[PDB]
Amino acid sequence: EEERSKVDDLRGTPMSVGTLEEIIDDNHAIVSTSVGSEHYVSILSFVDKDLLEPGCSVLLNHKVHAVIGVLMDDTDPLVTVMKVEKAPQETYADIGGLDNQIQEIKESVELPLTHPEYYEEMGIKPPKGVILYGPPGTGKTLLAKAVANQTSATFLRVVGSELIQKYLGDGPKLVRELFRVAEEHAPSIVFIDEIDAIGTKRYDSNSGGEREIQRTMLELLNQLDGFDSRGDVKVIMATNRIETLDPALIRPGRIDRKIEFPLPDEKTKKRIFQIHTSRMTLADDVTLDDLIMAKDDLSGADIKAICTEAGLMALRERRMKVTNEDFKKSKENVLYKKQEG
Amino acid sequence: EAVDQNTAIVGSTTGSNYYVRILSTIDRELLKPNASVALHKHSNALVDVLPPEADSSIMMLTSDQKPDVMYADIGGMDIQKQEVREAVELPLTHFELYKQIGIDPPRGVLMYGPPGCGKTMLAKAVAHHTTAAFIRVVGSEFVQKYLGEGPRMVRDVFRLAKENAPAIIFIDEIDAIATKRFDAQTGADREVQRILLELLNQMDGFDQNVNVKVIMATNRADTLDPALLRPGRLDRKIEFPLPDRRQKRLIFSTITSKMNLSEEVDLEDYVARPDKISGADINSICQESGMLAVRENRYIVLAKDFEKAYKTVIKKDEQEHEFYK
Amino acid sequence: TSTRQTYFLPVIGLVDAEKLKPGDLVGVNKDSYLILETLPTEYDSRVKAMEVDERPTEQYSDIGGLDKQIQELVEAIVLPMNHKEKFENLGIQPPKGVLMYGPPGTGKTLLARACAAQTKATFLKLAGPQLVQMFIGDGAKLVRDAFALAKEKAPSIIFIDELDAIGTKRFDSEKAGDREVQRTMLELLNQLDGFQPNTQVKVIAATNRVDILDPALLRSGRLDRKIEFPMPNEEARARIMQIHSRKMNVSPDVNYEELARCTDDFNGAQCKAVCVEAGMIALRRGATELTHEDYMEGILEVQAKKKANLQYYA
Amino acid sequence: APPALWDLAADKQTLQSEQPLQVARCTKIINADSEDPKYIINVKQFAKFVVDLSDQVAPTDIEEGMRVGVDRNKYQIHIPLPPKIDPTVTMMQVEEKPDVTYSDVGGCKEQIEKLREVVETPLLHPERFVNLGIEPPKGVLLFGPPGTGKTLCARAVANRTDACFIRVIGSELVQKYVGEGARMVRELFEMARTKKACLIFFDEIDAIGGARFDDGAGGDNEVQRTMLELINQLDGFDPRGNIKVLMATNRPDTLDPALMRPGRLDRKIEFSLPDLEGRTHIFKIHARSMSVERDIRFELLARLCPNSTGAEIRSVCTEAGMFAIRARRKIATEKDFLEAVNKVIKSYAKFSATPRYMTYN
Amino acid sequence: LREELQLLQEQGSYVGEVVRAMDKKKVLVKVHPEGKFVVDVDKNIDINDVTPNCRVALRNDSYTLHKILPNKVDPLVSLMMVEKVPDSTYEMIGGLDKQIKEIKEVIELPVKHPELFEALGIAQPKGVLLYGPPGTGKTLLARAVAHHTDCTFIRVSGSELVQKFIGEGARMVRELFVMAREHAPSIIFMDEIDSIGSSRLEGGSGGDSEVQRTMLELLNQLDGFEATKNIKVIMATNRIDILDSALLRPGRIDRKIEFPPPNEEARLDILKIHSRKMNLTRGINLRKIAELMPGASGAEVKGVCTEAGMYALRERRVHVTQEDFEMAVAKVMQKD
Amino acid sequence: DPGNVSYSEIGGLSEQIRELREVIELPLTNPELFQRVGIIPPKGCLLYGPPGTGKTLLARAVASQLDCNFLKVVSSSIVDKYIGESARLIREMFNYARDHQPCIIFMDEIDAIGGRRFSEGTSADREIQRTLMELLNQMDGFDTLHRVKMIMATNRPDTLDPALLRPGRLDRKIHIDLPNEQARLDILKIHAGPITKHGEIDYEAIVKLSDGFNGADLRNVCTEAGMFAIRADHDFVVQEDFMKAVRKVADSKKLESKLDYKPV
């Protein structure tokens, strides 16, 4: 009450922005802030003198430069790249016939957070995460698994080690914060899509050599190893080429799981196809079976995107209805897309 | 800039933006968007700008105060001057013809290749006839210990050019400021390449009419940014054409028509034998055999000195990577 | 100034043009702008003194078997310390360049310092990490200052190390950081080649290997003496640990030929650790003194490799 | 709020205690002292001054190039401050608190004991080397499969009896701006000497210790420093390091510290690694876990799993609970997971044998 | 005057930028030549009147904030954008009647229609490209269709200094993905990487890989998660990477359109488009002026009357004759 | 530099010795002999190597030999730590070179300040290449530097990039190779002059025994031989020890003679 109208004069009139640096163990905090100006603050209010911690920012008086208050300021590229939020509307009921694959990871997506008891009733402690892979280009069908995992906890998806390869290290460090800001958001989940590290070779901008890119992946696991980190952030990882990864990534984690993605079979293509054309009204002669029955070795993306070609001409005529006379004939274009392209 | 009525924002010559109520009796007319306003001793109040101006650096000449070198000696560059022919004289002396033709005059000019150099000395040429500014400037000479001096130069460079116009400015070896870099120690240089951006910004105020000739040279085209070659910036590229039989016989005749020449001298044999490689720098090679007359006690240079100039520069065949079809 | 400024003043005020052409540290206070006295000297912290130590606490007389070649080396430090008078007769100049190398060990790390106890002149330790430079020109200015403080404190001693860290310039760009700091060595050369004043305070260099560096370094001004230190031989190998184990008790029978005969590739430093683990089982044995059956076990205990298995043969 | 109320109360005594010592700025290193009254001090504000002291400071108690407090009006000598550098990457690298003690050992007895006699056995009694010493040895060597690396450090984390030791993460040593970590490895040892013998451990020492070289062009050059720079840190006579050292790696290269370690270090030992026996303890790390069905047998599964390390076979016993909760199984029978074990070994040995023998060969 | 001339010295005055406001009524503002401050109200303009990242006049005495001014961020970005290319429009372009009959449905239906996207039941088209000769109008089509719809336009990297100018360091594509959240509908483009020269078969791969990834991670941050509509991306190439696009394209996720070679159709009118401003009589033959320029490029039409005018310039004539145009018909085609 | 007479104390070589006099001296005294023929004055000179050696001393010798006015350029400190703009200092030096004119400039190590920017990287290269741009423009004038004589020598004449490699910036091509044993016969005299011994000498003995060396390499080892021979504490030493020491010692010194052969 009166304290608010008392210390406002000590605060007053303005107060600067400092950078919290180091402490005399007597709690006289030596700071380097522009330009390299120090101070000694043992002040009684608002602290929490400990946790403000080295390597932070402070707010200093003019006379004389005592930090009377502190903030946590981001923004920054740190928090921005993790979020927000999202939970897109797709579900794990979208992909059928592979339930054998997701019912495996079902307990892996379920047991952390939801339904935790029989983890600790067994007490065997399986919090080892997951690894993913499959042909040819997959992992958005695993995003169709990941879009379902958005029903629980919180999630971030990252792509590649690219943020390290943009320049000479720089270490892992942008991965480090992304790893330890998931501790700030713990419990959470983090996934890196299709690790290209040594799978792809050349770099954008400037990078080298192999070992610094080798070790930034080696440190990626060794930080996640870790010494000694309980933090989850249940780690989801995927690459569609099992070759290039260093095989030692499996044993520390995830040890138990790397999902095998089977290519779609005849009835799986039938199970998958109608989910798309459910919304797009087919004409009388349009049939799901015969087309995909004759066609072989398709992809869920194509069998989803084969409906888009009819979404051109029928929409060029501005028609709500698909026509198989086109959908047959237009399929040649997507057939030409796979054949010649 | 002037933000609103009776006030405005200004940086000092120490480079800090301010907010001041301007002097009352003069609100606007002479203040202008871009000028240099004299600030109150104590307050830094907005009072009055310069005439403008005596400006600061260079400022121009270099012809009446020297040096100047006649271009008419070297005729091998005629086709390289064909650009500069149509791209200099009439662009400066006629802004009206560009309304009549329906085509806008480009500011694009390039140079490249050195050695053989040409370039800077070819920029000394048109200083004979066309009377305008000529500023010797590189990328690294205007580097400072303070970041704000760039517009204290380049923003002044523009306001000193167009106000003293008709005027021309050539930046010798612009390639120094095109480097891609990050670290905040170069943050000043990042600001001087933001100044390069700020001069990229405010140079387009030359459009239209009076005045500029933007003429450019680099020995390496690697790090030049796309916005430096941007449409409406460099629309015309000059490279280095290699001197050849015409240019050789021209560079053969132009050098020896001054220094003592002999009936012994037949240079048609040398439009072939040394011409199989160079190239060069022949101009200095043309002076090299002249520099071989100082070995004597000589009046007219011999033929053994002609070959000695060819045997000194250069070799070789060669090579492990060259001779392999 | 210290604030980078510059001023135009009627002549000082207090001391006069007597000295000097512009130096450092001229006393002035704020607006007074007058120079009372010029206080010597130079700079800076550990850049000033790389390492200033009393000396190594032991003498080379403990270690042996490398004698005759260091008997050649100790001349290079001692003959300018004393025996330069021998050259005053016939007009010779003392050796400047000298090199010390070979893989550990050897033991130059102890030995190259151990000779400083007999130099008696002030010693300075230079090493590759010193040649690691945050900013540019320091190492140059350091060596410019190092040989200032050398000729200033002359006679003194300076010995450098990790020459191979800056050894190669690469050749072709692009680019090396030490390629600029090679000029510190080139100035170190320019001071030992293009400049006279380096004559005093003889400097020595060392590396783990001489593999690849600027090969032009051969001269008296730049490095001259090249002494290959091989694997210590049974002469030293028996004596090295003998002087390393003279600190500790021995059951008074030890071959010392046993090791010396069976020592192959064993470094002089490994022999220091041979008596350690031999003494470590003597520790956990609760034993009063060390015996050869405990010694000879430590031979194959430290090296080599294994465990693997013993079979087929047993 | 009663914390917050008493929290704003004594600012009166803080503002009264503010005026003295508040101007102690700026932290400043000295340069030289020619005679008794005089000093010259140098700061990073660019201010360089040849100036006197406050009478509370004695001349012989102060060191050259020492960060001190000063009243910048008189430019006095207020108090010297020992610390210099570095920032929180240290406090990240520097670590504290215990956890993961001895008993987490997976049955390795004298593999850890040979390295238990090197570290905590001398640390239990530094007096032990008074009579017999001679020396506690210089260094060690560790490498093998993952199992179990850095947990022996975690074993040293909980069982550390004196001061909290410092982990070292590899990819923070390699840095831009040549010589960043070069300062660190040098200066952090004095920061470790500030902790008076408190131990250190380096991780990924093979990556950061990179060896040896190629003709051109480095690249490794600036890192060729750090290795030999650490060798200079190794070649520093003192202590060294009073912390001994403990080093875990993967491959035999890098060779230069591995051929420098016979020039300094000692005690080359090895994982542990799988054994015919210790797997029963890695299967007894699950002993008190769950409730072992009376008919579940260790030796039955232990004899079926070659080259098991500890990693997967910890989850091997765990993947019972995987299908248990999935199949509703109340507790697990050894037959349940060993069906999925012979699966999970083969299914994961189909693509990957994890050739640890090949990694270091 | 004297009072404000008395007021303004003992303090000065400056201009700040608010990066945040406080519950205590204070405001986070930088002193831009120096380190930041944090000051308080400033009782005329309240907290809710101004939002962070806005220009205010830093007061010089209490170090508070005096007045309010607008601040610019995208006018630096959009100028770096508008540096590269202008737009023009349909009328100023020609020969694309085939492909504008395609891309138009990709653009306007997400702008105008979308309530009938669900009537069909498909989401927004993720992208599009025009492959062929490099080549003319694809970048015009980019910005002009962006201007046709008035939806804002964005490009890819970007040289050196549009990067840290937004943020500090990151994957760096998220901030660009945040840019489109501020302005929608928006058009993003790959500038340029249409060429056969950047390949190198390795050294250009990784350079292109993140240029390829710049669409991928964006496609992964467009379709994969986040939201929602109105955001688009464009590609351009000739060959090679077009087949490498198939490496990125087992149908996922883009639209494939070809960029045509020039033909006499456009050659007539697109020259007539450039012929609006120039001085020329109506006695010029369109047949020979078109057909004398087979192959070449769309940039050929630029050089038609320029170098022809250059000699007419040199000649000083007001309106030209087709002979001088026929002269440059050779000139610009002499090189090939 | 002592000498002057160090002119005759460099041994070889004539067309290296004598031509550099015509390259530098005569431009100073008689520019009329340049305009008599009409030839432009060479404004600089270039050495290179290091086959053989002496690029630095022959410079150092000529400085105190040629007399007149000369100013040496120390190649090291230019980087100037913070704000490496110090290429301006070359103009700041050239300004007095236009004031004190005539004056002469030796430059050792133009190669590491000869940075290529071949494949550009990091930061410290950018300040280099920028410091080069002025050196070009200073010689690219807009100005006449003729009264200054720029002398250039370094490890190799390769990395300098072609801008320097042309005349103008590099006026002439001069270098050193392995001195001939005939010229090495003279290089030992100036080594054997300052050392006095017993009167038994065959100069060609060491010249025929010790082969393919350099002046300093010979001398220093020849003095080292005297120092190796005086290890016996006896004063005067016949060539016996030297026909052994210089022979055997330089054999060790020729082990690191490897890889000394550099491009032109």
H or E stretch at E30 = strand E26-30
Q: Do C162 and D229 touch (CB under 8 A)?
A: yes
Give CA–CA dist D241/E213, Å, rounded: 48
Residues 6+ apart with CB under 8 A from E25: E40, E41, E47
Q: Is A12 annotated as a binding residue?
A: no
Is E18 within 8 Å of E29 (Cβ atoms)?
A: yes
Task: List the one residue out of A273, A265, A301, A134 whose CA is nearest residue E248.
Answer: A301
Residues of C in Cβ contact (< 8 Å) with D144: none
Quick one: CA torsion of D343, D349, D354, D358, rounded to 10 degrees? 150
DSSP percent split of chain D into helix, strand, coil, nearest 5: 40, 5, 55
Resolution of this entry, Å: 7.0
| Sheet strand arrangement including B169-171 | B136-137, B169-171, B214-215
How buried is E335 (Cβ within 10 angstroms: 0-12 exposed, 13-18 middle, 19+ buried)? exposed
Q: Do C279 and D134 touch (CB under 8 A)?
A: yes
Question: A15 pairs with which residues across the strands?
Answer: E38
Is C254 within 8 Å of C295 (Cβ atoms)?
A: yes
Taking one residue from B and the other from E, the number of pairs with CB-CB distance under 8 angstroms is 99
Q: How distant, in Å, are the alpha carbons of A68, A211, D32, D140, D209 from that of D254?
A: 51, 12, 43, 15, 6
Name the region of D66 (left: φ>0; alpha: ψ -120 to 50; beta: rest). Answer: beta
Residues of B in Cβ contact (< 8 Å) with E310: 86, 103
Give CA–CA dist B157/B58, Å, rounded: 9
**Other beta carbons within 10 Å of E281:** 10
Task: List the one residue out of E209, E79, E56, E65 whose CA is nearest residue E154.
Answer: E79
Give CA–CA dist E252/A301, Å, rounded: 6
Q: Is F49 annotated as a binding residue?
A: yes
**Other beta carbons within 10 Å of F181:** 17
Q: Is E39 helix (H, G, I), strand (E, B) or coil?
A: strand
Give CA–CA dist E236/E98, Å, rounded: 17
Query: H helices of chain D, where?
Result: 2-9, 11-16, 89-93, 110-116, 120-124, 128-131, 151-159, 180-193, 205-208, 220-235, 255-260, 279-282, 298-302, 311-327, 334-351, 356-359
N- to C-terminal Cα separation, chain A: 74
Q: Judged by CB atoms within 8 Å, which residues 232-251 of A form the interface with E?
A: none
Q: What tokens were used for D337?
A: 């997971």
Task: List the one residue out of C203, C266, C261, C258 whose CA is nearest residue C230.
Answer: C266
Is C235 within 8 Å of C65 (Cβ atoms)?
A: yes
**Other beta carbons within 10 Å of B309:** 22
**Other beta carbons within 10 Å of D255:** 12
Q: What tokens were used for A200?
A: 């792809």
Task: List the one residue out of A187, A155, A141, A168 whose CA is nearest residue A299.
Answer: A141
Residue of B153, B294, B308 to mutate, interface with F, max F Cβ within 10 Å: B294
Return the exposure string of B278-297: e unless at least 16 CB atoms fall within 10 Å of the residue's CB, then b. Answer: bbbbbbbbbbbbbbbbbeee
Q: Is D107 helix (H, G, I), strand (E, B) or coil?
A: coil
Is B154 within 8 Å of B198 (Cβ atoms)?
A: yes
The radius of gyration computed from the CA coordinates of chain D, to the nearest angstrom, equals: 28
3-state helix/strand/coil string of chain B: CCCECCEEEEECCCCCEEEEEECCCCCCCCCCCCCCEEECCCCCCEEEECCCCCCCCCCCCCCCCCCCCCHHHCCCCHHHHHHHHHHHHHHHHCCCHHHHHCCCCCCCCCCCCCCCCCCHHHHHHCCCCCCCCCCEECCCCCCCCCCCHHHHHHHHHHHHHHHHCCCCEEECCHHHHHCCCCCCCCHHHHHHHHHHHHHHHHHHHHCCCCCCCEECCCCCCCCCCCCCCCCCCCCCCCCCCCCCHHHHHHHHHHHHCCCCCCCCCCCCCCCCCHHHCCCCCHHHHHHHHHHCHHHCCCCCCCHHHHHHHHHHCCCCCCCCCCCCC
Task: List the one residue out of B165, B157, B79, B72 whose CA is nearest residue B121.
Answer: B72
Question: B49 pairs with which residues across the strands?
Answer: B37
Is F184 within 8 Å of F218 (Cβ atoms)?
A: yes
Whether the link from the prior residue into A254 is cis, omega within 30° of 0, is yes
Closest CA–CA distance from residue B13 to any residue of chain F (Å): 20
Running DSSP on this structure, what letter comes out for residue A204?
S
Give CA–CA dist F35/F41, Å, rounded: 9
Q: How distant, in Å, are the alpha carbons of C187, C202, D298, F216, F264 from that of F57?
A: 14, 21, 83, 10, 21
Residues of E in Cβ contact (< 8 Å) with B44: 8-9, 12-13
Tell me which chains share at least 3 CB pairs under 8 Å with chain F. A, B, C
Q: How distant, in Å, are the alpha carbons of B118, D345, E111, E135 from that of E129?
A: 43, 48, 19, 13
Q: What tokens were used for E99?
A: 């492909």
Give CA–CA dist A265/F34, Å, rounded: 92
Q: Helices C178-192 & C138-153, crossing angle to 10 degrees?
A: 30
Query: H helices of E54-137, where?
Result: 74-84, 97-111, 117-120
Closest in E119, E205, E227 to A202, CB measured: E205
H or E stretch at E152 = strand E152-154
Q: Do E220 and A157 touch (CB under 8 A)?
A: yes
Q: What tokens were used for C73?
A: 């080396």
Rounded to 5°, the CA angle E132-E137-E140 comes to 140
Question: F89 pairs with which residues across the strands?
Answer: none
How buried is C287 (Cβ within 10 angstroms: 0-12 exposed, 13-18 middle, 19+ buried)? middle
Give CA–CA dist F84/D259, Å, rounded: 41
Q: Do E67 and B19 touch (CB under 8 A)?
A: yes
Is E100 within 8 Å of E140 (Cβ atoms)?
A: no
Is C257 within 8 Å of C238 (Cβ atoms)?
A: yes
Name the region of D196 (left: φ>0; alpha: ψ -120 to 50; beta: rest). Answer: left
Running DSSP on this structure, what letter comes out for residue D269?
-
Closest CA–CA distance from residue A204 to any residue of chain F (Å): 13
Task: List the one residue out of A49, A79, A58, A47 whose CA is nearest residue A16.
Answer: A58
Task: List the one residue out of B49, B15, B10, B1 whose CA is nearest residue B151.
Answer: B15
Question: Which one-letter amino acid corresponds to residue E65?
Answer: L
Q: What are phi and psi of E14, to 5 degrees?
A: -145, -170
Give CA–CA dist F215/F55, Å, rounded: 11
Question: F71 pairs with which residues across the strands?
Answer: F105
Q: What tokens were used for A293?
A: 């029955």
Q: Is D317 helix (H, G, I), strand (E, B) or coil?
A: helix
Token look-up 């600001």 returns: B191
| Sheet strand arrangement including E65-69 | A15-16, E36-40, E26-30, E16-21, E54-58, E65-69
Closest in B18, B182, B225 to E159, CB measured: B225
Q: What tokens were used for F42?
A: 């060479």
H or E stretch at E242 = helix E241-248
Give me the DSSP letters along chain F.
---SGGGGGG---HHHHHHHHHHHHHHHH-SHHHHHHTPPPP-EEE----SS--HHHHHHHHHHHH-S--EEE-SSGGG-SSS--THHHHHHHHHHHHHS-SEEEEEE--STTS---SS--SSHHHHHHHHHHHHHHHHSSSS--TTEEEEEE-S-SSTTHHHHHSTTTS-------PPPHHHHHHHHHHHHTT----S---HHHHHHHS-S--HHHHHHHHHHHHHHHGGGS-S---HHHHHHHHHHHHHHHTTTTTT-----
Give CA–CA dist A339/E251, Å, rounded: 12
Q: Chain F residue closest to B69 (CA)? A: F142
Question: A24 pairs with which residues across the strands?
Answer: A28
Is E206 within 8 Å of A200 (Cβ atoms)?
A: yes
Q: Chain E residue closest to A137 (CA)? A: E250
Task: List the one residue out of F139, F36, F19, F124 whose CA is nearest residue F80.
Answer: F124
Closest CA–CA distance from residue E84 to any residue of chain A (Å): 21
Give CA–CA dist D323/D332, Å, rounded: 9
Is F176 within 8 Å of F157 (Cβ atoms)?
A: no
How buried is A241 (Cβ within 10 angstroms: 0-12 exposed, 13-18 middle, 19+ buried)? middle
Tell me which chains share at least 3 CB pairs under 8 Å with chain D. A, C
Tell how strand E16-21 and strand E54-58 pair up: antiparallel
Tell how strand F71-73 and strand E234-237 pair up: unpaired
Give CA–CA dist D312/A252, Å, rounded: 8
Q: What tokens were used for F88?
A: 């301006």
Q: Chain C residue closest to D66 (CA)? A: C45
Q: How distant, in Å, are the alpha carbons of A303, C87, F218 from that of F225?
A: 89, 12, 10
Residues of A in Cβ contact (< 8 Å) with E120: 279-280, 311, 315, 320
Tell how strand B169-171 and strand B214-215 pair up: parallel
Q: Do B102 and E278 touch (CB under 8 A)?
A: yes
Q: Is E287 helix (H, G, I), strand (E, B) or coil?
A: helix
Give CA–CA dist B173/B115, Å, rounded: 13
**Other beta carbons within 10 Å of A295:** 17
Is A67 within 8 Å of A53 (Cβ atoms)?
A: no
Longest dimension (CA), chain A: 85
Give CA–CA dist E305/E285, Å, rounded: 14
How buried is A294 (Cβ within 10 angstroms: 0-12 exposed, 13-18 middle, 19+ buried)? exposed
Q: Is D6 helix (H, G, I), strand (E, B) or coil?
A: helix
Task: List the one residue out of C237, C290, C229, C292 whose CA is nearest residue C261.
Answer: C237
Q: Do F123 and B186 touch (CB under 8 A)?
A: yes
Q: Is E207 annotated as a binding residue?
A: no
Rounded to 5°, the CA angle D51-D54-D55 comes to 125
Longest dimension (CA), chain F: 66
Give CA–CA dist C200/A219, Å, rounded: 50
The radius of gyration computed from the CA coordinates of chain E, to the nearest angstrom, equals: 26
Closest in C45, C127, C248 to D232, CB measured: C127
Name the region of C305 (left: φ>0; alpha: ψ -120 to 50; beta: rest). Answer: left
Sign of CA dihedral E182, E187, E192, E194: positive
N- to C-terminal Cα separation, chain F: 29
Task: List the one residue out of C32, E291, A212 whose CA is nearest residue D170.
Answer: A212
3-state helix/strand/coil string of B220-256: CCCCCCCCCCCCCCCCCCCCCCCCCHHHHHHHHHHHH
Question: Which one-letter amino acid corresponds to residue D70?
Answer: V
Question: F151 pairs with which residues across the strands?
Answer: F45, F106
Is A126 within 8 Å of A234 (Cβ atoms)?
A: no
The radius of gyration computed from the CA coordinates of chain C, to the nearest angstrom, equals: 26
Q: What are phi and psi of E304, to 5 degrees?
A: -60, -70
3-state helix/strand/coil string of C241-300: HHHHHCCCCCCCCCCCHHHHHHCCCCCHHHHHHHHHHHHHHHHHCCCCCCCHHHHHHHHH
Q: What tokens were used for E94?
A: 């020609």
Q: Is F53 annotated as a binding residue?
A: yes
Q: What are phi and psi of C148, to 5 degrees?
A: -60, -65
Q: How distant, in Å, are the alpha carbons of B146, E174, E176 from that of A159?
A: 40, 11, 15
Is C208 within 8 Å of C105 (Cβ atoms)?
A: no
Running DSSP on this structure, what letter comes out for residue A262?
P
Is A249 within 8 Å of A279 (Cβ atoms)?
A: no
Quick one: CA torsion of A327, A332, A335, A337, rounded to 10 degrees? -110
Question: Which one-letter amino acid corresponds to residue F131?
Answer: T
Task: List the one residue out of D288, D193, D292 whose CA is nearest residue D240.
Answer: D193
Task: List the one residue out of B69, B65, B58 whose CA is nearest residue B169.
Answer: B58
Token look-up 């100039």 returns: B309
Closest CA–CA distance from residue F116 to any residue of chain A (Å): 18
Give CA–CA dist F109/F76, Å, rounded: 9
Q: Helices F55-66 & F14-29, crossing angle to 10 degrees?
A: 40
How buried is A336 (Cβ within 10 angstroms: 0-12 exposed, 13-18 middle, 19+ buried)? exposed
B311 interface with F at CB cutoff 8 Å: no
Q: How distant, in Å, are the alpha carbons of B73, F59, F61, F151 from that of F42?
A: 20, 17, 21, 11
State yes or no: chains E and C have 3 or more CB pairs below 8 A: no
Q: What tokens were used for E62?
A: 């209490």
Q: Is C22 annotated as a binding residue?
A: no
Running DSSP on this structure, what letter comes out for residue A64?
T
Tell how strand D28-32 and strand D40-42 pair up: antiparallel
How buried is C142 (Cβ within 10 angstroms: 0-12 exposed, 13-18 middle, 19+ buried)? buried
Is A168 within 8 Å of A206 (Cβ atoms)?
A: yes
